[PDB]
């Protein structure tokens, strides 16, 4: 017969449905998410937080009796704390807790389908941003983590104590396979550890992929024999279908490449599939975060990149681009520091200034190597070491190929600059302040660096950051 209680048909607000509970005690097995909620005028912040919690877990817009056929009370997500954002009356920070049982083990797709599935287009919320997440130890252990990881990567390369140096081949599009290999040989022989395909170099009318792989591997091995170093080039296996990606990855495997690269734009399932492949085939997997800033640039809506850093460290990627503070792409020093910590550290401590809202143990999953790329040049070296630290791949595309005396000279300039800088750091010199002089001193012995310092001397990228801290 018809029901008569909390489960009788009708619309009641999400806060009354059980998704708002300020007294909830966070269980160590819960997935916690922090949202920056801007409710519509007239919507109570608590109701908006409850609406987000409800629609990312079990609720719909009207009461459904079928809840009674489940342990409904356990499966409902609970918003347990709503605070106002420091200097913005419209925005609120809502802490929501989700039960472990709601998620499929080892699946980024299932996690995102609940957390970012529908709630960002909910009419009652004017804007919504996912800021951070606490992923519990028990959930983290169902994920592979980095295929190689920083530590093993450095052991396979026999390169320790300094950042690694890379370079995107330029022009972005248009070179042939033969010419791509030319650039790779020159840059690696000149002193770079790695060179890479640009993210949009895949297989096109001007150059199909098999030529590039064959010619690049010739160049990599020639450079290795010319230097006595392990060298590599990120062969881009991004493709339209999984079978086509596997074909490219397996050919790179056959040729003995130490590394391959994929673009975020292939999507989460393809990334997870390639992370497993890389672990099983002793291949370093580099992720280029193509498309990331489509949702991470604005403070009021989208997803903050530290969340993507957690999901990708979970997925199993070995490198991810995490920004340069001083380059041509967006990177506020304090927020970028948070990203680097997320990728490199065994345990994250809550620090409101960096936007790290939760303490989180990483369940001994391997470390992701951050990649710093875009509009950087020697000269900025002292502050690159200062903001990004030791475990990072510094990539100089234009900063190498744009050098007037040739690509080898560009590569040497960058390599000498790097080494002189961490030598000075290790000698306990205040390299931040003395930096211009350290570089100038090294330039006296290395003409290539002198010319690089003169050329790009005044190039700076002073612009106001969009993604900033709320506690400064």
């Amino acid at each position: 017969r018809i029901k008569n209680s909390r489960y009788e048909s009708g619309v009641i607000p999400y806060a009354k449905m059980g998704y708002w509970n300020p007294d909830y005690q966070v269980k160590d097995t819960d997935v916690l998410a922090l949202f920056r909620v801007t409710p519509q005028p007239g919507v109570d912040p608590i109701e908006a937080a409850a609406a987000v919690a409800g629609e990312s877990s079990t609720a719909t817009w009207t009461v459904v009796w079928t809840d009674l056929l489940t342990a409904a009370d356990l499966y409902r997500a609970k918003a347990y704390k709503v605070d106002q954002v420091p200097n913005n009356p419209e925005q609120y920070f809502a802490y929501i807790a989700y039960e472990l049982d709601l998620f499929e083990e080892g699946s980024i797709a299932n996690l995102t389908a609940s957390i970012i599935g529908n709630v960002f287009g909910f009419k009652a919320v004017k804007a919504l941003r996912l800021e951070d997440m606490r992923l519990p130890l028990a959930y983290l252990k169902t994920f592979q983590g980095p295929a190689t990881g920083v530590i093993l990567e450095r052991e396979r390369l026999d390169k320790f104590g300094r950042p690694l140096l890379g370079c995107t081949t330029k022009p972005k599009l248009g070179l042939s396979g033969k010419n791509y290999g030319r650039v790779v040989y020159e840059a690696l022989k000149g002193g770079l550890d790695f060179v890479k395909d640009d993210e949009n170099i895949n297989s096109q009318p001007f150059m199909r992929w098999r030529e590039r792989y064959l010619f690049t591997m010739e160049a990599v091995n020639k450079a290795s024999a010319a230097t006595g170093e392990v060298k590599g080039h990120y062969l881009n296996v991004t493709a339209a279908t999984m079978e086509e990606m596997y074909a490219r990855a397996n050919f790179a495997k056959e040729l003995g490449s130490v590394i391959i690269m994929i673009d975020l734009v292939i999507g989460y399932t393809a990334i997870q599939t390639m992370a497993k492949w890389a672990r099983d085939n002793d291949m370093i997997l580099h992720l280029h975060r193509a498309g990331n800033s489509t949702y991470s640039r604005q403070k009021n809506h989208g997803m903050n990149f530290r969340v993507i850093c957690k999901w990708m460290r979970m997925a199993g990627v070995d490198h991810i681009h995490a920004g340069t503070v001083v380059g041509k792409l967006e990177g506020d020093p304090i927020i970028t520091r948070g990203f680097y910590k997320t990728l490199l550290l065994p345990k994250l401590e809550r620090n409101l200034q960096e936007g790290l809202f939760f303490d989180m143990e990483w369940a001994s999953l391997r470390k992701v190597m951050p990649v710093a790329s875009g509009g950087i040049h020697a000269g900025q070296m002292h502050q690159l070491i200062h903001y990004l630290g030791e475990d990072v791949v510094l990539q100089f595309g234009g900063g190498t190929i744009g050098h007037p005396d040739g690509i080898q000279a560009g590569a040497t300039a960058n390599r000498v600059a790097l080494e002189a800088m961490i030598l000075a750091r290790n000698e306990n010199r205040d390299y931040l302040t003395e930096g211009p002089e350290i570089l100038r001193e090294a330039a006296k012995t290395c003409g290539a660096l002198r010319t690089a310092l003169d050329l790009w001397k005044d190039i700076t990228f002073n612009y106001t950051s969009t993604d900033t801290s709320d506690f400064v």
Binding site: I151, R154, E155, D158, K159, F160, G161, R162, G191, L214, M217, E218, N221, K222, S224, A225, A226, T227, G228, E229, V230, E254, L255, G256, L345, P346, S364, K367, T412, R415, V416, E419, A420, I422, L423, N426, E427, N428, A442, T445
Partner: protein, 138 residues
């Protein structure tokens, strides 16, 4: 060629004064310090010969300098490197490795190109000195 394996090999060969400052860095980070050597500098030659046992709790840099110089005296025409290891849980690996001795002249490497399926090649890199027996190198 100049073998550019090692953290500081694009810079000039470090003076004992410079090496001492690097050992101070290793001591401040509580690293175990090892001295290794070889006359087969193939990039993939993961295991160079250890000169003794890694010095574990080092307080005085001079102790390490003494062993570096002892190794240089006994293995003059060898590549010698200093390695710093960190036992900290997330790391448990080498965090610095730099060359402190090089032979007077390095020949370089031979590149072998074996033709395989279609245009695929299988490569062998081999140092020219490693075509001579160990006792006759450099």
């Amino acid at each position: 060629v100049r073998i550019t394996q090692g953290t500081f090999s694009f810079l000039p060969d470090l003076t004992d004064e410079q090496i001492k400052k690097q050992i101070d860095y290793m001591i401040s980070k509580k690293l175990a310090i090892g001295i290794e050597y070889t006359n087969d500098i193939h990039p993939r030659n993961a295991y160079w010969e250890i000169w003794g046992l890694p010095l574990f709790d080092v307080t005085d840099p001079a102790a390490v300098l003494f062993e570096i110089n002892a190794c240089r005296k006994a293995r003059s025409n060898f590549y010698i490197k200093v390695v710093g290891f960190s036992s900290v849980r997330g790391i448990e690996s080498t965090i610095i490795s730099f060359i402190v001795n090089r032979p007077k002249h390095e020949p370089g490497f031979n590149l072998m190109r074996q033709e395989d399926k279609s245009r695929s090649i299988k490569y062998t890199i081999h140092s020219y000195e490693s075509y001579k027996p160990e006792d006759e190198r450099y």
